[PDB]
Structures are given as structure tokens and as C-alpha cells.
Design a protein around this ligand. Structure first.
Ligand SMILES: Nc1ncnc2c1ncn2[C@@H]1O[C@H](COP(=O)(O)OP(=O)(O)NP(=O)(O)O)[C@@H](O)[C@H]1O
Ligand SMILES: Nc1ncnc2c1ncn2[C@@H]1O[C@H](COP(=O)(O)OP(=O)(O)NP(=O)(O)O)[C@@H](O)[C@H]1O
Ligand SMILES: [Mg+2]
Ligand SMILES: [Mg+2]
Ligand SMILES: [Mg+2]
Lengths: 246, 298, 402, 267, 298
């Protein structure tokens, strides 16, 4: 299967990416240094780790895959690859597997060394369930912004404006959408029902990421897992629909 | 017949960049697409690859549809310029394409020895030159006995030993039964290896056929040169009576342009009187036929 | 209702001093003569469950060593255990045990009464709305309630319009209010300990009083509640672990999330050297209660130190010495006790959370973490809050934890 | 002169950068927005420490967005080897790029703090215009110098690298280190030691950070609340006058430009 | 003499990429540097431009020092690939280079006509082709009548009309007294315009001199093709007696490789018997000499 044959490239190309390994080291240092100041200075420190992985796991995913499609179009290999026995779906889905297992490994070095810094500086029956819920949901947050990066790469025609949109999606989905949620609270009260606001949190995958790190809320947990996976499944379907229109 | 392109007219939206080309590529011949820099040489290959949609025309590649993966297993293609993946290494990127095309990984290494990039193998693609990438870009197209090549300028930035070694690699593939399409700009030299040139203008395919057909159809002068002739100035007369402009650059070098229809009697004039130190009876080249056919369409 | 002389008192001393022997009695009893009666420890003067058991109407009565049991519960007719009339001036009620569903010691209009060392176990089944007061004081000048132990009454040591009196060393456990104050101008209270109480100290509309050294261990929803107190003095109080809850009646206060100190319309008072420990709110400052000397306290372990819903600035440091804050991430270069940078306990996003509780869902967001940093970077958007220049670097109340 | 002839390119090439004009208009619409919020709250020393903090985040950002690809953006673009075959030196195509990119920052902050001054003289009625002109004249000729430091930083990190994608990694690294890491390293050194690491050296560590020398210049007269300053409340412990703080900002240019020329000479 | 390079052994640190080249370039001639892709061709021009240090050697451009700015005003240079400034326009970047070289700005517009970029002038360089950039890359080199051009592969990605116009533009600059150095790979065709080829191996400069001198030293076969001969199989004998291998591809096409020392008597055999339909007496090309010397070096 060539969905794996193009996935083995992106592992080998991602592990020699100098930009990724700098940030993934910085992700693992900040995950111990928050955990050092949460034990020496727990659900109170796993919430501060959730604010860290809401900053960086969208940033790691957008650093990997903002030049996934349009970086191959600028390199000319994309027009070459379509002449191979390859659909346009298998290029995208295989890059999603290849870029997906990088940040599925970058949280295993990120939080795999953070769980080592808690297990040697403190309960471990609660640790492997609160971090199993943390590492899985941090990968699924990263796979949304991976699929967001494939959407913006397929729309743009140049690599320089791809980073201009990947920064734009990162600003909008991390810290502009919640600032306009507060501005809809503190500046609008006659036309803003605040009971509706626990339901508008499902329109933001960074927000659904924190909600499955804050339980340990009108909706249950199982819809919240299926609302994070729906952000993958719609945006990958959006990325496949956009990639077929090049 | 390998490629049967009939009546196809590809448009970039409104602007019809190609128009009414009726191209037929036999199963063992080697076609040469030549033209301007905007004559549609690169886009005409995209019609063969099936990646670009044949608006108001049908393309029959190998008796099948041009976007089938069943025929893309035997369709190697080298694009114009491919800075492939500069963080990958040169051997590994060819291993990457071999897994994609269904080629065996044991076919990878001796392709580097065949193309001559074995010494710079296992080195990063950013460490490669322009010509070194062209050897690598050729190498992926040769993977797993492709019935149809498509080369768009394989000889750019490439040494004249290696380009001459490239055409021998092409002529090896001609004997195995694989049609090749060249889209070049190094028109002197390539005429020994192609079978049918396919000089095209902006939209329309101008002329096709072998070089024997083009020189028979397009009337071009033979460029004779009598270098180191004994006398030149009364030898100005010896071709004007036969209807040829006896232009002479140096003191004893007449580059006369004759008819190539009375070659024996004009050369019996040249071999009978006037001494032949070094003679260049030069046939009308592909470049002259290129020069004739581009202006004739304008 | 018989009298105390209708019992069998064996006189030990001929200075109007009596001694009741060990043995039970029955019914209400009445003091009309100045009898300094003592009792053996087996003198269980047990009433039947109706009326005030030991009414006192004569001045200078030294009641000592009695054990009262099961008086009435009609709080309107004031079924006390020891009722003390206004004519019963300078009464001493020393070392007594009381267990009954009404008032323990109801005094009114008296002067210089001393209710010392008694143990008043109120009730077990009543809903803290009819348990009766432990030590009810109604407009008394001179009272001395010392080293008592009131348990499971209704609203603890109730004090209504009583002017000059001391409350020293009394232990108050599992009651509704710990110490209730109503218009008690120029009062005083020292070293009292209140445990597991739905309000540790009710300070309502009483001026000029001194609250010093008192302790409140694990009380519910209000450590020290001060309503409309002026020219007061809050020095050395130890308020620990004010957990959330409700008073159950919501009569004069409301239910709280746990506030170690709640200042409601208290204009001038000195709040120094206190220790507000491990509550949900360290101090709640209402908007009407401003400009009073708050310096030298210890706000340690509280989940939110100050709640101040206003936009007026509020300096919290008199004479250049401020308070110790546990989350004060500051330094001390010039080696004095004071910190070098001022400490704002509240952001702007810490007051959006008070205005809108739905922001608690957004409280872990990076945009909130951006907005906490934007206030620290751009001080124009910082609303004028409850800062203190020169906060303390070390704990000043090193002795109050013992 | 050849130094101006290559300055005229970058002056006409930086103004076609759509990324510059976005975040230089963002510097203009924030310096009015801070100064409008500074007029509605009236204090004055809070609007100085926020504008100096605004230009701490953006004048290094406009400088590093402009000039991170000054040498390596010409080197991998092929036009650097061509340019040395013109009648130039390596010192003229760097100082010329410094003049060319320096006039953009001298204009991006004269636009930014220029409309900030008209958003004060037209908003707070009765404001002293002499104190306004002196304070915002001090903002103009010192945010350029902060911009020219990070401009000269960007020529250092462009001459060292050989790939423009790695120059963007270093320019983000220099912007993170000098703006909001050295302010946090010095904060974490002061909090965890409780001011007892060194009671005399620690104010001199502000001079190893040009964003802190920039904040110390503009917060000279209007100290006010120390909690608005943060770690710049160490600035009262500096025995140096205000005029040397200008000179330590110019020495951050001239050392990091002479380093930029000595690196470029062995490119 | 324009460029007098002697004794230069340019080293990339330890490795000596050039070795002892003694090159001399006359004041009106057109030199052609040809070789492998790792033969040191681009680096040999860096010695002339002065931006590379001559290790244990000296470079004399115009009798002056190679890094002096007094001589760089008359030294145009076109590199291999220059994506110039993709945000600038076409006219302004040529105006930009004109101010640097000290050329008058009145020369800028008519240079664009002279190279043929006037239709695409005042347009962004990111909107340019590879061949369009080579036109722009040529256009900056010609500013302010330079005494010495340096063109490294000027005809890559270029149409053979435009390459032929380019050498006409080169030969026009030859008449003005401007020495040109070509660093090429498109070797058939350029031999009509150069004066002295300067084919070099990996380290050493192999041979210089005119095409006559290279044909005189390196004894190479003349490639007589007699297509359309009457009989071929008994015409196999008619050159083997004279010492030539009479290889014949088709039924009637002997592509004989003779000695070029007996040109008259071999052709009188061909003109006397056997009819000459179309003959190609091809002299040993530039590529033929290039094939000989590089294997003679190794
Ligand atoms: N996406 C596009 N939109 C519009 N025009 C295009 C597009 N792609 C190519 N063209 C134009 O189509 C024409 C022909 O392209 P092309 O097939 O490359 O001709 P060409 O001769 O092969 N170019 P060259 O590589 O120099 O030979 C040129 O004028 C191009 O500018
Ligand atoms: N900076 C460098 N450091 C080390 N080796 C280098 C460097 N630049 C070039 N080389 C080597 O120098 C040799 C020849 O360089 P070059 O002058 O480009 O020959 P060349 O023929 O011009 N290459 P080409 O552009 O294909 O013609 C090659 O082996 C290069 O790898
Ligand atoms: Mg083409
Ligand atoms: Mg101090
Ligand atoms: Mg070269």
C-alpha cells in the first residue's frame, strides 16, 4: 500500500527536519519545567500542562504541514507524484499518517518525559489514566491542526503565503476565538445568552482539548471525544475535497 | 500505437494554449517536441500524463485512458526542474520512488551506476548541482521498465559527455520497445537519435515527421563550406551560375548555400577545381528546420 | 416554679454562701436573695423541660459548680437555663454544665456579670433555628464572659446592644454563628476559638470594638463577617480553612463559597497582623467599605486572596509596611523586611470571573494566559485595584500557628 | 555614493513587503489604542510603560522581519555573488542595507508614535504639549535605536547561516531571547534567590539586554508605580545617569554592527 | 592581453579544485570554458572576478588587480542561476543594477529591447520564466560597455532562436573590443562564435587555442556520412583500403570515419562512383574534441 510508502518518507523527512526537533525539544523541556513547578512549588498541574499543549501542539502541527502540499507543488514533486500509481487521496492521507505519527511521537517524548518527572518527584494509578487521557487528546488536538494545515496548503499557491495562513489559523483558533467569546460576554449582554456559551465551546478544537483535560459541563465526555474526532473527519474531508481541485 | 492524441485543445480557462494537435506516437519511436518557451511543450506532456484534463479532445495512452493507475505503472516522467526533497539523501529518495512505482528496491542502486551518480549517492539533495539533480531526475523515470518516457529538457546543466551518454541510454531504451518523448532546447545533437520531430508553434502543431520528411517538405539549403580552398573570389562565380549565394567570411572559406538537388555536379566543380583541405557539407539541421518552421507560423 | 431556698442547701460559710449536696432536683428554680451558692459535682439540677430553670433576680450572686439539665425550648418566653434579671447586677456564674434546648445564659440589662468557665452543650437534633443561644447578652455594660465552652447552640455568643464587655478565651464548637454582635458599641473580645461553624464571627453594626487574637478553625463560609463596623481593631486573628457551605436560614447573612474575612460597609478600622489561611477567599472587600488601615496580615494558602469588585485604587500599606502574600513572587534587594515591587492581587480577568461565572470554562485557555500577561505588559488596561506597595517578605504571624 | 544606491533598493523593497506594512500599521493602531485608553483612564506613567512595552514587542519584530534575509536571502537568491562583482565592498552592501532598512524603522515608528501623539493632543484636553513633545520625542529617537539594534542583530544572524529557513529560526530565537526570555530569566533569578544572589551585580545585568535599556530610557522621568515596571524596578539601583543609557544603546548597535561586518567579511 | 592568469592553484581548503592553470585571454577574442560539472568551471571565473582568493597564484585582469573597483565597472558577469528579487519589477532591478555599476539610466530601457524583455518589463520577477530571467540576467551584464563579459551557461532554458540571437549579441560585442568568456554545455553551435576553446579537466587546464589548433593536435576522424549511396556493401571496401572503418547503419548509409589527411582522394572515390544523394562531410566537432580530451585526462 502506497499510503504507507509515502508515510515512511514523512517520518524520514520529519526526523531530519531541523525546525521540528528544535520545537519538540522545547516542548519537552517546558513540559518538565511546568511539572517541576507543580510538584515542588496533580490535576492542578495537568491543567497548566493543558495550556502548554494548547499553545504548542497547534504550533507543532502547523510547523510540520503548512508546506506539505504547496511545498511539494513549489518543489515540483507534486506534479511528478500524480503521475505515479497514486490517487490524490493516498498522497494526502499518507502525509496525514506520516505527519500524524511524528506528533504522536512528539507527545511521547514530550509527555513521556513529563510523566517521568512526576513519577520520580511525588499516586501512579491516577497518573497513567490522567496522562493516558492527556497524551491521546493532545495527539488528537494535533491531528486537527494537521488537517487544518492540509486545508490551507491546498488553497494557497505559494509557500510564503502558506505560512501566512498557518499563522492566521493558529491565531484564530487558539487566542482570538476565545477573546471574542469574552468580548461577547463583557460587551454584549442584551443579545448574548450566557447559557448558550457552554455549547459554543464545541466550535473550537482547542477548546474541546481543554474540556477533556478539565473534567478530572452540560455535555458528557463521550460526545466531546466524538466532537474532537469530528474536527479531524470534516477537515480531512475538506482537505481531500480541496486537493482534488488543483 | 503508443500515444494517440487527436484534436485536443487545452485551454487555461479562456486562453486555448493548445489547439487541434493530432499527434501519433508509435510503439518504438522517439518523438521530439520543440518550440518556443511558451509554445506549450510542458503542457502537452500533461495531456499525456492525464493529470491535466483534455478539454474537447481525447487522449488514448497505450490503448487506455490517460489517468489510469494501471498505465501509470509504465509511464516514467522527468519534469523540467525538480529540487526533490533537499533534506532527503540521494539514494533514499530513489528508494522512495521505487516503492511507489512498484519497482524492486534491488533496481535502485545500479540505476545510480547506470546514470553515473553513484559517487554522489547517499548525499543530501541540497548538496546536488543542477546537472546532478537531472541525473537523479532521470533515474526515477527509468524505474521498472517503463513503456513510455516523458523527458522535458533532461540535458539542462549537463556535461556533453553525459548528454551523449544520455542519448545512448535513450537508444538502449529504444531497442527494448519503449517510446520516448523529448522536449529539448539543445537541438543540435539530438537529431541523430530521434525518429520524428514535432516542432510546434504557440498553439498549433506545425510540422511532424522524420528529418528526411522535413528536409523533403521544407525546402532548405545545404550549408556547404569549402575551407582552405585555393581561390575564393573567382569561386564566388562558381555557385552563382548554379543559383547559389557564395558568401565567404574569411579569405578562403566560402559558406555557400546550395540547393541539395544538384549535389554531385556542384561538388565535381568543387572537387575538380579548388583544393579540398577541409570541407563541411553540412545538411540542414534540426535547428535550421526549427528556424524555418517557427517563422513560417510566426 | 419553686425557689432555690426550697431545696436543701447545706451552708458552709455564713456570708450568704451555700452548698447544695450531690443529688438531683426538679423543676425551675428562682434566686430572689443574694446567695453565693456552690454545688457538689453530683448536683444535677435537672428541670423537666419547661421554663427557665435557674432564674436569678438578686444582685451579687455567685452561682458555682451547678449542673443544669433539660429546660424549656420556648425562645419567645426565653426558656433559659440561667436567666438573669436587670436587677441581678454583678452575678458570677462559674463552672457550670448545661444541656437543654433553649437559651443557656440569657442576661439582659445587667452590669458586671461574670459568666466564667461554663460548659454549655446546646442540642443535637434541632435544625440550628430553635436551639437557643449559648450566651445571650442583651444591653449589658460590664459583662465578663471568660473561658467558656459552648457547643451546638444557636448562634453561639449572641450579644445585642451591650456596650462594654470582654469575651476572653471561649471555645465555640459546631454552632450556627460563633459570636454574634448587634449594635455592641465599644466592645472587646480576646482569644476565642470557633470550630466548625456556619459563621465564625458576626460583627453587625457595632462600632469601636477590639477583636484580638481570636481563632476560627474550619468554619463554614464566613470567617469574620463585619457589617457596618467603624473605628474597630482587628489584630492577631487567625482565620483558618473557611470552607463553603450555608447557614441554613439565610437570615442576616447569605451562603458563601468560603471567605476568611468579609468587609461589608465597614468604613474605618485597623486590620493588622492577622492570619487568613487556606480559605477559598482570603478577604472580600465590598465597594462601600474603603480606606481603612489593612497592613501586616498574612494571606497564605487562599485560592483567591482579595475579592474587590471596584475600579477605585486601594493602597493596603500604612507606614510603608504591607502584608505578607503567599503568592507574592517578589524579591528583596535592600535587606529589609519589605518586598521591592508592589503586589496586585487581582488581574482584570480575575474580576471578569466574579462578574460572569461562565468564564470558569475559559479559565484554562491560552487567551486568558495571554490576557494575564498583557496586563503585566501593558499597564493601561490594568483596572485600579487593591495593590499594596511594600509587601512583606516573610510570615509575620510566626506565633499564631501554635 | 554606493551606500545610498543600495539603500534605495531596500527602501523600495521593504515598502512592498506586505508583512511589514501589516505589522507596522498594527504598531500604529495599537499605539493609538493604548494612548486612547490612557486618555480615558485619567495615569501618565502607565501610558509610558505600556508604549515602551509595545515597542519592545514590535520594533524588534519589524527589525527582524525586515532584515533576517538580508545576507542569506541574497546569498541563496544568487544575487550576492553577483553583487560583489559590482564596484562595491562587503562593507558597503551591509551598511547600505543598514541605512536602507534603518530608514524603514525610522519611518515605521515615526508613523506609529506620530499618530500616537495626535491621539493624545486631540484627546486629553489641557495636556502639556511640552511634556508631550519631550516624552514622545524620547520615544521616537530611542525606539529607532532599539530597532537599529535588532536590525544589526539580524545582520549577524543572517551572515552566520547559509539557509534562509534557518535564518528565520535564529531571528525567532533572537526575538524570543532578548524580549521575553531575558526578562524572565532575570525575574526567575530574582524570585528564586529572593534578591540574595547578588545585591550589587543584578542591576548591571539590565545593560546586557537592549530591550531593558530601551525600557529604562523611556521610564526615566515617569517612574511612578514600580509594579508597572516589574524587573525594571531594579533600574533605580543603577548609579549610571540617563545619558550613558543612551550610549549603551548605541554601543549595542556599533558592537553588533561591527560584528556584522566582521562576520560578513569572511562570508 | 585582457586576462592573464598564471600559476593559480585555487584550493577549497585542503582540496585543490584548480591546479596550475596558465590561461591567457586576448583583448577581442571569445574564450570558451568547457568541462565536467566538477571540473571547476564556475570557480575558474570566480578567480577572474576577484571574489575568490588566488591561492599560491596571481590573477591579472586588464593588467590590474582582480578585486579593484576601478576594473569592476567594466566587468559584466552573469551567474548560473539568479532568481533576482521576486518582489521587484523587471525594469527597476535593471535600474537598480545600473546605479550600482555607474551606467546611465538612459541605457536601461533599450537594453530591455536589445534582449527582448520589453513585453514583460515592469512586471514582477516572480512572474518570470527561467528563460526570461536569463534574458534579465544577461541584461545587467551589458551595462555601461563592459570590457570583459563572464557568462556562465547563458543559454539554459532558452529557445534556439533566442540562443542564436544571443551569440549575435555576443559577436556584436566582439566587434566593440570586449572580450567574452563562455562557460557552456551546449557545445554544438557555440563553435561558430568563439575564438579559442579552453576545455579543462577536473584540475588542470587541458588545452586551449582555436578549433584549428585542437583539430591539428588531436587527430580526430572526419565523419563522412554518405546517405543514399547507390551500393553500400562493396562501398564497405572503398574506405578500409584507405584505413577507415566503413560502418553502415541502413541499407545504403555508410557513416564512414576517415582520417582527414586524404580528403580529396576519398571523396573522388565517392564522387566518381556511387551517387551522392545527400552527403554530410562533418568536421570533428567541439563535442568531438571534448570527447577526446576528457578521456585523455581520465
Ligand atoms: N497555470 C497557468 N495559468 C496560465 N498560463 C499558464 C499556466 N501554466 C502555464 N501557462 C502558460 O502556458 C504557456 C505554455 O506553457 P508551457 O507548456 O510551459 O510552454 P513551454 O514551451 O513548455 N514552456 P518551456 O518550459 O519554456 O518550454 C506559457 O505561456 C505559460 O506561461
Ligand atoms: N563552496 C564549496 N566548497 C567546496 N567545494 C565546492 C564549493 N563550491 C564548489 N565546490 C566543488 O567544486 C567542484 C567544481 O565546482 P564548479 O566550478 O562549479 O565546477 P563546475 O563545472 O562549474 N560545476 P557546474 O556549474 O556544473 O559547471 C565541484 O566538485 C564542487 O562540489
Ligand atoms: Mg517547456
Ligand atoms: Mg527590600
Ligand atoms: Mg559551472
Amino acid at each position: 500500500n502506497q499510503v504507507w510508502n509515502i508515510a515512511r518518507k514523512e517520518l524520514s523527512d520529519g526526523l531530519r527536519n531541523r525546525w521540528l526537533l528544535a520545537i519538540s525539544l522545547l516542548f519537552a523541556v517546558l513540559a518538565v519545567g511546568i511539572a517541576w513547578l507543580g510538584a515542588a512549588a496533580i490535576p492542578a498541574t495537568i491543567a497548566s500542562l493543558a495550556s502548554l499543549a494548547t499553545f504548542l501542539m497547534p504550533l507543532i502541527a502547523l510547523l510540520l504541514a503548512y508546506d506539505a502540499i504547496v511545498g511539494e507543488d513549489e518543489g515540483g514533486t507534486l506534479m511528478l507524484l500524480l503521475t505515479y500509481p497514486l490517487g490524490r487521496g493516498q498522497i494526502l492521507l499518507g502525509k496525514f499518517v506520516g505527519h500524524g505519527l511524528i506528533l504522536a511521537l512528539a507527545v511521547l517524548i514530550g509527555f513521556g518525559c513529563a510523566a517521568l518527572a512526576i513519577a520520580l518527584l511525588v499516586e501512579l494509578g491516577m497518573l497513567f489514566w490522567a496522562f493516558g487521557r492527556f497524551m491521546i487528546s493532545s495527539t488528537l488536538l494535533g491531528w486537527v491542526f494537521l488537517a487544518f494545515a492540509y486545508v490551507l496548503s491546498g488553497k494557497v499557491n505559494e509557500k510564503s503565503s502558506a505560512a501566512g495562513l498557518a499563522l492566521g489559523v493558529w491565531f484564530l483558533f487558539v487566542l482570538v476565538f476565545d477573546l471574542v467569546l469574552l468580548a461577547l460576554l463583557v460587551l454584549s449582554e442584551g443579545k448574548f445568552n450566557p447559557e448558550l456559551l457552554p455549547w459554543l465551546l464545541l466550535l473550537n478544537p482547542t477548546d474541546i482539548y481543554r474540556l477533556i483535560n478539565l473534567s478530572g459541563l452540560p455535555v458528557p465526555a463521550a460526545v466531546l471525544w466524538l466532537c474532537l474526532l469530528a474536527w479531524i473527519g470534516v477537515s480531512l474531508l475538506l482537505a481531500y475535497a480541496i486537493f482534488r481541485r488543483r | 500505437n503508443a500515444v494517440e492524441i487527436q484534436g485536443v485543445s487545452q485551454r487555461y480557462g479562456s486562453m486555448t494554449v493548445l489547439h487541434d494537435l493530432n499527434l501519433n506516437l508509435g510503439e518504438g519511436e522517439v518523438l521530439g517536441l520543440f518550440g518556443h518557451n511558451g509554445a506549450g511543450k510542458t503542457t502537452s506532456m500533461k495531456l499525456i500524463l492525464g493529470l491535466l484534463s483534455p478539454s474537447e479532445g481525447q487522449v488514448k495512452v497505450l490503448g487506455r485512458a490517460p489517468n489510469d493507475p494501471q498505465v501509470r505503472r509504465q509511464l516514467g516522467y522527468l519534469p523540467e526542474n525538480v529540487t526533490f526533497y533537499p533534506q532527503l539523501s540521494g539514494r533514499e529518495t530513489l528508494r522512495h520512488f521505487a516503492r511507489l512505482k512498484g519497482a524492486a528496491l534491488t533496481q535502485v542502486d545500479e540505476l545510480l551506476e547506470q546514470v553515473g551518480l553513484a559517487h554522489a549517492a547517499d548525499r543530501r539533495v541540497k548538496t546536488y548541482s543542477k546537472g546532478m539533480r537531472q541525473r537523479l531526475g532521470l533515474a526515477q523515470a527509468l524505474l521498472g521498465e517503463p513503456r513510455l518516457l516523458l523527458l522535458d529538457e533532461p540535458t539542462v546543466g549537463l556535461d556533453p559527455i553525459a548528454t551523449q551518454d544520455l542519448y545512448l541510454l535513450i537508444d538502449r531504451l529504444r531497442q527494448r520497445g519503449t517510446s520516448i518523448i523529448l522536449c529539448s532546447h539543445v537541438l543540435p545533437g539530438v537529431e541523430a537519435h530521434i525518429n520524428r520531430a514535432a516542432i510546434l508553434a504557440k498553439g498549433c502543431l506545425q510540422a511532424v515527421g522524420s528529418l528526411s520528411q522535413l528536409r523533403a517538405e521544407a525546402g532548405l539549403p545545404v550549408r556547404i563550406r569549402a575551407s582552405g580552398i585555393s581561390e575564393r573570389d573567382s569561386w564566388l562565380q562558381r555557385w552563382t551560375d548554379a543559383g547559389h549565394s557564395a558568401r565567404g567570411l574569411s579569405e578562403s572559406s566560402i559558406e555557400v548555400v546550395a540547393v541539395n538537388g544538384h549535389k554531385l555536379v556542384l561538388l565535381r566543380q568543387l572537387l575538380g577545381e579548388g583544393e579540398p583541405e577541409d570541407i563541411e557539407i553540412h545538411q540542414p539541421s534540426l535547428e535550421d528546420l526549427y528556424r524555418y518552421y517557427m517563422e513560417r507560423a510566426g | 416554679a419553686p425557689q432555690s431556698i426550697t431545696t436543701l442547701p447545706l451552708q458552709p460559710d455564713g456570708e450568704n454562701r451555700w452548698r447544695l449536696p450531690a443529688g438531683e432536683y426538679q423543676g425551675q428554680f428562682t434566686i430572689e436573695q443574694p446567695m453565693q451558692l456552690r454545688c457538689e459535682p453530683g448536683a444535677v439540677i435537672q428541670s423537666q423541660g419547661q421554663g427557665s430553670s435557674l432564674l436569678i433576680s438578686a444582685p451579687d450572686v455567685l452561682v458555682e459548680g451547678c449542673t443544669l439539665y433539660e429546660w424549656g425550648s420556648d425562645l419567645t418566653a426565653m426558656d433559659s437555663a440561667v436567666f438573669i434579671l436587670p436587677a441581678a447586677e454583678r452575678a458570677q456564674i462559674s463552672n457550670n454544665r448545661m444541656r437543654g434546648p433553649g437559651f443557656g445564659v440569657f442576661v439582659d440589662g445587667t452590669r458586671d456579670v461574670q459568666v466564667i468557665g461554663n460548659e454549655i452543650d446546646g442540642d443535637a437534633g434541632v435544625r440550628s433555628q430553635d436551639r437557643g443561644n449559648g450566651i445571650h447578652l442583651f444591653a449589658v455594660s460590664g459583662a465578663r464572659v471568660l473561658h467558656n465552652h459552648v457547643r451546638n447552640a444557636r448562634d453561639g455568643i449572641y450579644i445585642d446592644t451591650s456596650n462594654g464587655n470582654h469575651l476572653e478565651g471561649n471555645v465555640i464548637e459546631d454552632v450556627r454563628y460563633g459570636v454574634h454582635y448587634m449594635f455592641a458599641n465599644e466592645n472587646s473580645l480576646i482569644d476565642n476559638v470557633t470550630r466548625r461553624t456556619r459563621t465564625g464571627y458576626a460583627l453587625m453594626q457595632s462600632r469601636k470594638l477590639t477583636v484580638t487574637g481570636n481563632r476560627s478553625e474550619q468554619d463554614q463560609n464566613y470567617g469574620i463577617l463585619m457589617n457596618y463596623i467603624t473605628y474597630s481593631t482587628i489584630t492577631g486573628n487567625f482565620v483558618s480553612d473557611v470552607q463553603r457551605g450555608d447557614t441554613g436560614g439565610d437570615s442576616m447573612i447569605s451562603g458563601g463559597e468560603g471567605k476568611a474575612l468579609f468587609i461589608y460597609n465597614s468604613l474605618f478600622n485597623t486590620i493588622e497582623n492577622n492570619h487568613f489561611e487556606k480559605s477559598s477567599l482570603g478577604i472580600h472587600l465590598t465597594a462601600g467599605s474603603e480606606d481603612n488601615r489593612i497592613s501586616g496580615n498574612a494571606f497564605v494558602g487562599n485560592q483567591q486572596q482579595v475579592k474587590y469588585v471596584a475600579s477605585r485604587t486601594q493602597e493596603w500599606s500604612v507606614d510603608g509596611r504591607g502584608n505578607y502574600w503567599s503568592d507574592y513572587l517578589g524579591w528583596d534587594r535592600n535587606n529589609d523586611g519589605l518586598g521591592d515591587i508592589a503586589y496586585e492581587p487581582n488581574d482584570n480577568v480575575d474580576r471578569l470571573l466574579w462578574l460572569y461565572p461562565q468564564v470558569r470554562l475559559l479559565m484554562n485557555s491560552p487567551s486568558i494566559e495571554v490576557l494575564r500577561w498583557v496586563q503585566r505588559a501593558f499597564p493601561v488596561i490594568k483596572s485600579p485595584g487593591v495593590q499594596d506597595s511594600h509587601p512583606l517578605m516573610k510570615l509575620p504571624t510566626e506565633k499564631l500557628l501554635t
